[PDB]
Amino acid sequence: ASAATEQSPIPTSFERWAKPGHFDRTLARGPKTTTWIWNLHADAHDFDSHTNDLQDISRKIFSAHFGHLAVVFVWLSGMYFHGARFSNFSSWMADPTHIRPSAQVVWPLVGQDILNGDMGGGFRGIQITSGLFQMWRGEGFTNEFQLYCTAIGALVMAGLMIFAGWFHYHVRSPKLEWFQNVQSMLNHHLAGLLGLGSLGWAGHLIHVALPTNKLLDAGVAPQDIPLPHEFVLDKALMAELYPSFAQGIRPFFTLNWATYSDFLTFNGGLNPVTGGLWMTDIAHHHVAIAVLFIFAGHMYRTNWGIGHSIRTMLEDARHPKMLPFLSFIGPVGHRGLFEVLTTSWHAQLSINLAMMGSLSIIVAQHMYSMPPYPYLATDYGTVTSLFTHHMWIGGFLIVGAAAHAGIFMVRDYDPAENVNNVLDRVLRHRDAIISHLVWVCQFLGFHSFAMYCHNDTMRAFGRPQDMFSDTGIQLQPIFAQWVQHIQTMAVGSTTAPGVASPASYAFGGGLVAVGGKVAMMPISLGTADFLIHHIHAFTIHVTVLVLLKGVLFARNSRLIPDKSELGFRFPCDGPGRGGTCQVSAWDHVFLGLFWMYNSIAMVIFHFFWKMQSDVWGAVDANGTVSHITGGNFAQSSITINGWLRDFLWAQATQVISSYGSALSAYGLMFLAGHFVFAFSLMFLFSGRGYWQELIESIVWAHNKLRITTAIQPRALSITQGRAVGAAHYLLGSIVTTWAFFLARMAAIG
Amino acid sequence: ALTGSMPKFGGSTGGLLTAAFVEERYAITWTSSKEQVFEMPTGGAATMNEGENLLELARKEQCLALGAQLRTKFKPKITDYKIYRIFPNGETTFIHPADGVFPEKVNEGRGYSGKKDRRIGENPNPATIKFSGQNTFETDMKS
Amino acid sequence: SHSVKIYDTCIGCTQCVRACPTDVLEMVPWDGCRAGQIAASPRTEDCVGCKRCETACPTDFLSIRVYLGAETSRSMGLAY
Amino acid sequence: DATQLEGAYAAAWLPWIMIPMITYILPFPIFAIAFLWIEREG
Amino acid sequence: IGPGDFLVHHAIALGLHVTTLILVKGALDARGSKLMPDKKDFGYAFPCDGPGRGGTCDISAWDSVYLATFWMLNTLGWVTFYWHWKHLAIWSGNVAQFNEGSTYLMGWFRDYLWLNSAQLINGYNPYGTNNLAIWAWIFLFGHLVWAISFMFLITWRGYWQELIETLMWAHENTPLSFGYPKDKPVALSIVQARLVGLVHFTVGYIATYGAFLIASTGSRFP
Amino acid sequence: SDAYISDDPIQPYQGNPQLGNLATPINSSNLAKAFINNLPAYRPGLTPFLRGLEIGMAHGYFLVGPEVVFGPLKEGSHGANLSGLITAIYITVSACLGISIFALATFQGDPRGTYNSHSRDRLRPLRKKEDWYQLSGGILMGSLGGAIFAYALLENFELLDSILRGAVNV
Numbered sequence A: 001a002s003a004a005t006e007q008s009p010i011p012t013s014f015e016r017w018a019k020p021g022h023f024d025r026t027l028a029r030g031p032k033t034t035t036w037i038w039n040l041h042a043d044a045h046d047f048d049s050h051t052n053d054l055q056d057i058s059r060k061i062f063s064a065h066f067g068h069l070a071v072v073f074v075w076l077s078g079m080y081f082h083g084a085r086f087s088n089f090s091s092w093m094a095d096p097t098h099i100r101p102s103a104q105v106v107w108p109l110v111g112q113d114i115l116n117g118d119m120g121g122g123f124r125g126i127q128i129t130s131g132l133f134q135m136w137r138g139e140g141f142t143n144e145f146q147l148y149c150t151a152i153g154a155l156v157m158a159g160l161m162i163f164a165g166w167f168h169y170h171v172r173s174p175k176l177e178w179f180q181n182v183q184s185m186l187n188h189h190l191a192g193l194l195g196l197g198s199l200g201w202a203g204h205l206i207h208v209a210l211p212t213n214k215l216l217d218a219g220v221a222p223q224d225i226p227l228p229h230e231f232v233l234d235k236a237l238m239a240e241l242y243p244s245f246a247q248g249i250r251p252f253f254t255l256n257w258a259t260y261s262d263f264l265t266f267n268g269g270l271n272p273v274t275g276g277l278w279m280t281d282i283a284h285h286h287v288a289i290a291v292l293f294i295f296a297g298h299m300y301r302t303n304w305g306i307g308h309s310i311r312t313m314l315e316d317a318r319h320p321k322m323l324p325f326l327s328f329i330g331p332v333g334h335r336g337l338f339e340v341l342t343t344s345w346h347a348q349l350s351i352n353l354a355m356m357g358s359l360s361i362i363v364a365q366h367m368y369s370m371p372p373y374p375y376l377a378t379d380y381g382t383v384t385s386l387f388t389h390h391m392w393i394g395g396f397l398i399v400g401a402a403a404h405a406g407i408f409m410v411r412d413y414d415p416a417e418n419v420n421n422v423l424d425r426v427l428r429h430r431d432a433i434i435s436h437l438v439w440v441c442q443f444l445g446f447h448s449f450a451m452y453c454h455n456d457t458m459r460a461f462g463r464p465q466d467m468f469s470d471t472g473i474q475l476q477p478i479f480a481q482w483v484q485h486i487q488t489m490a491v492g493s494t495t496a497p498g499v500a501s502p503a504s505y506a507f508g509g510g511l512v513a514v515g516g517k518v519a520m521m522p523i524s525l526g527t528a529d530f531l532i533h534h535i536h537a538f539t540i541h542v543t544v545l546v547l548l549k550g551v552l553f554a555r556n557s558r559l560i561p562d563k564s565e566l567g568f569r570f571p572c573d574g575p576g577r578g579g580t581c582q583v584s585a586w587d588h589v590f591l592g593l594f595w596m597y598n599s600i601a602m603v604i605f606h607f608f609w610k611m612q613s614d615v616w617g618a619v620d621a622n623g624t625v626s627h628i629t630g631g632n633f634a635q636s637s638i639t640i641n642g643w644l645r646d647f648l649w650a651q652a653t654q655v656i657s658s659y660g661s662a663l664s665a666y667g668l669m670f671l672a673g674h675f676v677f678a679f680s681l682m683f684l685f686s687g688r689g690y691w692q693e694l695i696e697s698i699v700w701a702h703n704k705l706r707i708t709t710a711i712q713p714r715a716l717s718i719t720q721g722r723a724v725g726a727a728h729y730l731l732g733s734i735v736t737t738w739a740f741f742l743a744r745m746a747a748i749g
Numbered sequence B: 001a002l003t004g005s006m007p008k009f010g011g012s013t014g015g016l017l018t019a020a021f022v023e024e025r026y027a028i029t030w031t032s033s034k035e036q037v038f039e040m041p042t043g044g045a046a047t048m049n050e051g052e053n054l055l056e057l058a059r060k061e062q063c064l065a066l067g068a069q070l071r072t073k074f075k076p077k078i079t080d081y082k083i084y085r086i087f088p089n090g091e092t093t094f095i096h097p098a099d100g101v102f103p104e105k106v107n108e109g110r111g112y113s114g115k116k117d118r119r120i121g122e123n124p125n126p127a128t129i130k131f132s133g134q135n136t137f138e139t140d141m142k143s
Numbered sequence C: 001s002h003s004v005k006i007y008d009t010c011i012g013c014t015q016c017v018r019a020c021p022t023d024v025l026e027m028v029p030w031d032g033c034r035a036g037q038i039a040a041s042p043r044t045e046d047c048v049g050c051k052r053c054e055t056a057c058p059t060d061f062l063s064i065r066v067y068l069g070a071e072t073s074r075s076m077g078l079a080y
Numbered sequence D: 001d002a003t004q005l006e007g008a009y010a011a012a013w014l015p016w017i018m019i020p021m022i023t024y025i026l027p028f029p030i031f032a033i034a035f036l037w038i039e040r041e042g
Numbered sequence E: 001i002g003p004g005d006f007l008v009h010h011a012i013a014l015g016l017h018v019t020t021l022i023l024v025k026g027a028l029d030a031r032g033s034k035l036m037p038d039k040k041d042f043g044y045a046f047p048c049d050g051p052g053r054g055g056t057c058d059i060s061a062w063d064s065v066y067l068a069t070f071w072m073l074n075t076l077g078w079v080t081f082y083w084h085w086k087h088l089a090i091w092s093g094n095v096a097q098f099n100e101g102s103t104y105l106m107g108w109f110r111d112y113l114w115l116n117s118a119q120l121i122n123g124y125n126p127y128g129t130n131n132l133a134i135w136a137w138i139f140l141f142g143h144l145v146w147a148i149s150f151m152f153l154i155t156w157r158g159y160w161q162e163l164i165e166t167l168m169w170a171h172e173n174t175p176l177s178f179g180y181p182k183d184k185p186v187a188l189s190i191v192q193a194r195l196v197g198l199v200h201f202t203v204g205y206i207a208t209y210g211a212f213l214i215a216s217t218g219s220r221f222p
Numbered sequence F: 001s002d003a004y005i006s007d008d009p010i011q012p013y014q015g016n017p018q019l020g021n022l023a024t025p026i027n028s029s030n031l032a033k034a035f036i037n038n039l040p041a042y043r044p045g046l047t048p049f050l051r052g053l054e055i056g057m058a059h060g061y062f063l064v065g066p067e068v069v070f071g072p073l074k075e076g077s078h079g080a081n082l083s084g085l086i087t088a089i090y091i092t093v094s095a096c097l098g099i100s101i102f103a104l105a106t107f108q109g110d111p112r113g114t115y116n117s118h119s120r121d122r123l124r125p126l127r128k129k130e131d132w133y134q135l136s137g138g139i140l141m142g143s144l145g146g147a148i149f150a151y152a153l154l155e156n157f158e159l160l161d162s163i164l165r166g167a168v169n170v
Ligand code: F6C
Pocket: A435, A436, A438, A439, A442, D028, D029, D031, D032, E167, E170, E171, E174, E176, E177, E178, E179, E180, F094, F095, F096, F097, F098, F099
């Protein structure tokens, strides 16, 4: 006890494990049919339906968060253990340009050890593309014992995280007043989690990572390097590397900060040795954002008078206190939104999922162009995998944001609470929002894709002067070209005199090549880039249309005026009014999952082809860059046929010709993804009554053999058939692209 | 001709369109004991006045969704709502409650209007009513 | 308009009438079951065809059937 | 060689006028006639 | 005939049997089943019987011919793929390509679909056009129509009806837009969109394979 | 409580909160109304032929340009201007055939929708079929004339250029 906020019941009982459905009143009835089995896992985590008190739900959520953190620590422990026992980390530490990262060996079972490929140095394993080796090199790891220590620490943290979740629910659980302290939570997360976290990491970088990386770039062998604590212990060794450590922590308090300008650099480019960002520049970044986040954490009034109250700031943002052109939001403004966000967990989850997915996408777009780890940009499989993975995670998270914005509407939205505020006023003109989104999606679909169809027709006619090419009708992205020119002019010896190099070489500047291969070089933006960015705008907008339509019409529409009474996840409202199939908000999350797939797949395809034809390659002794596919994005990626021939047919040479090699698992998974995609269409195109009527004949054949079962076999429900089809489509269609990307990048480098 | 104050509402895009004035409009009237916020079936939140309220909607289903909200989401319940159909010439017709009770109760005097003394599995099978015009439930016998 | 037919297996539970979003159905005296009531569908020009009345019916097979017929502006549920 | 469309066949001026008539001159009159036929009132 | 023929004959047997299953099931359950005893009173084509009784999507007998058109198309795809690859390997002289390559599925994927596509998809490239340009264009056209089918096949009616309601709002409130629909815009019905998506799937499936079979054969053997 | 109790910039359309529109600055400000209500479609008092004539002149004029710059004939001046002229001609004749068949199909007895006698649409004021036929004739005349005026200015661009540079005063 220290804050007098716990005393939680729910005694740790064991008997409550042999009674599935104990959470739901109808789930603990007695199965009867098979739909109960699927209903068990359809709302197992939905703690909002189970009970009605916000405080009990908040306690459950807090302990579930702790258990999730435990799961993530188990995963981290496993990754560090794989890097410490089944890896060539030491070999890669010796030569990180000729050795392929590998952290997984296959047992010698049926045909199975062929997947163990030669990774350089006599190591027979699987080439990992997770970027773990490049991350551990940048953090400061040199030997595998340190990785083993980190694995043990993560396992201990996992055990500690599953004790904190049991102690904050079964022993001393917080009150609801503690969860509603958003001021204190924001202060602590902004200053103590982000601020102190990045400050501690800056301390690590300044005393462990910067030493080790400086010696590594100098040329020292990995086990000839001192361990990190000697860098911490004696200041003579550390002052050999940096001459600003001879004055200790004195120039900082006497505000002579340019003394420290040799390990807090502000270069802003790429290390020529490694290929990653300047490590001193990274440490300076973390110091600056620690000072920024800690200072940001003193903003909200907590127990001492000074600060803001978010409720006051929300309630004052309203007409006539707004900017005159922003005054259309009326005299209520954001008045009832502090009580929306402190009483609805779904509203918070919707905002946090949207921001988390957007930030994961930002992470994907900032780590190919500013490679932040040593020898990262030259391992093209890792760059591809990291960009692609974070784009998929971001897209899924963003779809879940709309999912929970719709769950908030059907369940947690109260019309009496929020009257004539921004939330009420959005629901009160949503036909305008949706119709204008329909028109912009149409405009973007004609002016991106139908231009590709124009190009196909003009190229098949034999009139390429009529095409939307760089040699036909040019469509230069002059605004992005101008931004690229401003970015390369800014960094001159201007508007950013402190930096030497450009923030990325993607904007302009020079060419960084490491080990012969290109780390980074300018990404020229022509007509093909205009066309593919408008493809991206179009697909993002139709995803927004599909998802926002379900959020805005989750309560009711002109068709079904009482859709909130039907639920958030219901199949339909019968074949009447023409047929109201897929009117729920859940069905809009269903249809937006497909559109997020179609949007993120084209983003990862644009990245793969453009980086493979206009950045990645092999620099010779002179300096001439021979790109991987040979600069064919500017003329083949402007037709659909060139996308099917010069990208899909041509670059799938390495995944279908992989049988009998060490990449044969990728060919197997390529075919497996095609199977699972096609198998999904059985659930997506067919309906429930066919399958229930065919199960009738199968039940008859079973009754005749007297093999009748008590649990009555029923077809999958309508929304469950939709969920199964969507999950299968996404799984197969993404496993296919994963196998295609990874087989391609593990064969041609 | 219809009595009641329009509920306090800022307007929406979900309201009446052309078909309201060229085909038909519906009106729902109800008495509330206090001025309080309800949910419009067209989207948004409106405030019913104390006393008599009158609201025009585009569909009968919207008027019945509002009425179901009145008699279930409010304590005390508002069960005295009346729904009228308004025609383009101005003609108003009291439709709900059709009798004057409430369809869910049983009134002496309503009369059968869909009853078929059968048992579903004994409609005349379609081979016999082919070129007749009748379809299998709009008939009179039982096979 | 749709055709809503009520059969003599009706038990007068009123659940079809309570589930109707458009007020097509009402209860009439019958003395053909022990509740003394049977459903009726006079305002079947209002029927949209949602079949909520059929979902609400407890008898096997249903004592109420909706047959989707000629579409009007009311049965298509059009506010435009 | 082939700078334009040709016909090495009899009455080769007939595609020259038949393709406009069948494909972009007579179709919108036919569409108008069919639209007036399906929208005429009793 | 050899070992690669036995497997594809068993695949053809599977295809004819499942297509017959769907069609026989929908014909014999046309008059009624346990889920809908009076199905003969509702006709041959009708959307469903609502979401009651667990849900009754695709319950009509017309929906069986709907669901078996996919299986007919798939079975005839297997049949014509077998015939075409068998004969391409015979006509090229390299019959061992089909012999020791049709017993596993990557051989079908790589030695038939990928391999005999190189001339078709190069019908027009950034360097010029040969006479296979229309077959490349129709190949892509069939892919487009087949993909458009999945819009009618996966997305269902209420989504589009609510979208069309917003469009009706937008049109009545825009200035200078003097047209007005004489007949009210509604989304395509349930059975209608099933038929439209099936027609699209069929047309794209026929166009893609017709363009591939004429160009993979007419290029190798002009 | 707050639902139309405070006075905001966004009002109900025509003071009726049960109408399916809002009074926003884009459909209800004095500048937006002064521009739109004085456009030929909405200018008070005009006969339908003069409305259509001015609409057509403005429309046939700009419809010449897209094919002059972007068309298949764009490599040569004379053919580009001719392709733009006949594109404007074809689009005009198609649009006016559509106007004529809209009037033919819509105005049959009492029309349905916004041209019914009971309709309250302020944004569609051509309530009679005679208005629509006069509009079709005017849009056709004005649009074909504006198209050939743009064509004649583009054909003589060498002369119009030497004029506007004072090269004709030698
Ligand atoms: C005439 C009548 C009319 C009018 C007037 O008058 C109109 C108008 C409008 C406006 C207001 C708007 C805007 C414009 C734009 O931008 O975009 C364009 C488009 C178009 C289409 C354009 C149109 C134009 C016109 C058509 C012209 C004519 C031409 C000629 C006449 C033809 C020829 C004839 C012969 C005989 C063939 C709109 C729109 C929309 N739509 Mg709408 N329309 C209509 C028709 C129709 C139909 C049939 C359909 C089916 C297909 C639809 C559909 C649609 C959709 C989806 C949408 C969208 O998205 C949009 C919106 O919402 O926003 C927001 N819609 N629209």
